[model samples]
Target chain A: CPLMVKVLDAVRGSPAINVAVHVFRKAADDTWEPFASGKTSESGELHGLTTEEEFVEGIYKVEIDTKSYWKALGISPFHEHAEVVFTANDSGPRRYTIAALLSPYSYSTMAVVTNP
Target chain B: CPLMVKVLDAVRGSPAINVAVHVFRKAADDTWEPFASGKTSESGELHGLTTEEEFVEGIYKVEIDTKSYWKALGISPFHEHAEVVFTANDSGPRRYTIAALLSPYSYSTMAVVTNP
Candidate 1:
């Protein structure tokens, strides 16, 4: 089963912001590798998510380049990126949703626990 | 003669979070008591800002509850309050600094443009 998550960020002014999500999984062999990817809508974000929980592993970290995204808006860069790092127990009842948000100067990342 | 701000919210785990900041000064008679207040230093917030450009003004708003400061750090309160609405043109080559952050659900606010 796929574990789920969502990414959310806070921004004011314009509504045009582009964002991306990069996911990786940890495996029994104690390694990590690219697992999945999601991009934000024209509204500036991605949707619910899942990790490569059973791939192969140690720990997991999510990455997004918000500063670059804002720069594309012709605004001065305030922050470069926002990252959320969480550990995986590789258990069956494990699931999560992460949200990422960015502005020229501020970036936010949240990883929520989901099981409902 | 007092215009500055600072507030940011990013979380990972344990960090007893608490925050607050309120300031007001709209006119010589448009009365808005408690026109000055700064709360949130418990490893949380405050410092810098000015709004009554000439002390004789009109519209203004700056409030923060941060969902009751992350439910008193006991967790489980995603977002109750996190607002930063900028609108003050009283002038003096004015300076400003506003930062607010929240977690449990998510909250963040930033207003940066300071004079060197």
Candidate 2:
């Protein structure tokens, strides 16, 4: 299974380029370890963050540094930190994509993938 | 049956005062008609807005003018409108309170009441 991420502007319903994103996998000790991190490209999408070695099914965390992004854009900040947690299915060849929609003060995220 | 509403800022985790609110009832024709309207008081709470006649039962709507509230507070605009939809249960001595947590870009709401 593979994973991808996309960031979007909640208001304009457009890509939110340059937003920093981080993904973490929970370790056996109940601690969170970084799995991957990156910034959204011109299209506000990031792939390759989840590689074969690190793409195992488990509980994961996604964090968006919303405050930093808004500051760079000269927009007043509303959300300092935004985080999402979800468990990956342990079944067969399931690909997942986490989509995050962000506004200055609010955000919503969904992870989805379907089998053929 | 009775209903009440409270508005709170998602950021500060406190009351959001002076925010204008509107409630509507869905008519049989599928049209929405205004049921109640008011502005939050100093405590960011509104009561008596929903009374016996209008609060009987059925699907109800609550709309918040987020843009206007932010403008009045001199904050950068994000959300243009916010609305919540819920179906009211027709049971004995039911009471409901809608607690809305709002940020400039996102919001969450919950309605609860119990019989003693």
Candidate 3:
């Protein structure tokens, strides 16, 4: 199964539209390389971050560029970026849902195997 | 004046004592150098992060190692680190305070010139 992400507004419980989400896969050299990127939709969700044809199990990091997201709305965020790093092991077909709860100065994330 | 930091519990509105706080100064090459390190006192406050003798103007980053802080309490944190980055310029004698409000899965920080 593909990985899905949902961006949300921490205060209003609304969809955080068009937020930039970048996915990086950890390399053998301990360096992170960008694997996928996209913007959230009107429903504050995006799926299939991993390559549609290539799915390898490893450590992955998702960066929500809230700095640019809030700055575009003329507000300053306390941190430049919000990161969600988790280890992924797809034994068979398991869809992981990463929900990014975002605010100007604070954020939280949760990842769960949806279709395990 | 010196740089002061106060760590607080986001949900309880209390001091987060003994939490490790690490300070890094941004170098001219855009790299970060570990400049100071300390643990919060009973009042969740630590000061004099910079060399107490020299007051330089540049960018700085402070990280509250809440991961270990929470893990010791047997709670898991969403992110491994909580960061507070800001610019400091002491024209004369000005103290900047960075307050870290922390929780198990979320955090927020604010930096302001106190004795301006």
Candidate 4:
């Protein structure tokens, strides 16, 4: 897999389950065009968003829909959404793991990139 | 004062020096209006962004300009910027510390909230 995501619930100290994730690639026109999307599994992970061949060098955005995630649990979150936007695979093909720690009113994101 | 920010450079494993931070509050018209702005010190912290009385209950956004920070070090970064958005002081006036760990291609954010 070229990309993977891990989401943790800071309030509960567990993997964030079933959180929605959407991936986008910046097109030539500089518009975000959807590439792939999925939801975190029971372990708070979503994998296989893209393959190595298709994951070209470009700007990518990962949108984490935290508002809905919190609303489902009877909590009102602050942000409309949480996002990480970055260029990927510029030097070479690399595997990426995006880790996000989330709270109702706050959240954190970290990235782990390694050679494939 | 009610809000604080700490930024870390994951690549250097030290405090991110002189990172520009911009604060915004969601206005009644649903647009983000500037509230305050500052830059992280040598310790990677920006404090006194707002006072207790002025930081009333509302949605807030903290924008961290990471691209320039990395560019200054002769590194090309992935994300144009990094940001944290959430509601604040809904239940009561609380103190918040926004912590961010940043890399050239990836970053993470976490929040520590306590009663004021």
Strongest candidate by lDDT: 4
Predicted complex 1: DockQ: 0.06
Could you give the interface RMSD of each candidate, to one decimal? 7.6, 5.0, 4.0, 2.8
Instruction: Give the per-residue lDDT digits (tens) of candidate 4, residues B1-116.
Output: 58999999988889999999999999999888999999999999999899999999998989999999999999977677898888889999999898888888677777788896
User: Lowest lDDT 10-mer window, candidate 4 chain B?
Assistant: B103-112
Q: Tens digits of per-residue lDDT for model 1 on A1-116?
A: 33433333334422233566677765568766676667766544454554354433357767776666666666778655676777765555544545454555665555544233
Q: Relative to the unseen true structure, what is the C-alpha lDDT of residue A52 in candidate 1, on a scale of 0 to 100?
A: 51
Query: Which stretches in model 3 have alpha-carbon errors above 4 Å?
Result: A1-3, A9-14, A51-60, A76-78, A85-115, B10-14, B28-30, B51-59, B85-96, B109-115
Residue pairs in steric clash, candidate 2? none
- Expressed as tens digits, the lDDT of each residue in B15-106 for candidate 1 is 22345667664455866445566765544445444444443444556777666666665667755566565566544554455645455665
Off by over 4 Å in 4: A9-14, A24-35, A48-57, A67-81, A101-108, B10-14, B28-30, B103-106
Which tens-of-lDDT digit does each residue in A1-116 have in candidate 2? 38788887754446888888999999999999999999989898888887656678789998888788778777676777688888987686677788887766667788888663
lDDT against the true structure, each candidate: 0.54, 0.78, 0.74, 0.88
Question: Top model by DockQ, which number?
Answer: 4
Ranking by DockQ: 4, 3, 2, 1
- Candidate 1 is graded, for docking, as incorrect
lDDT of 2 at B106: 60
Pick by TM-score: which candidate is best? 4
Model 3's chain A TM-score stands at 0.88
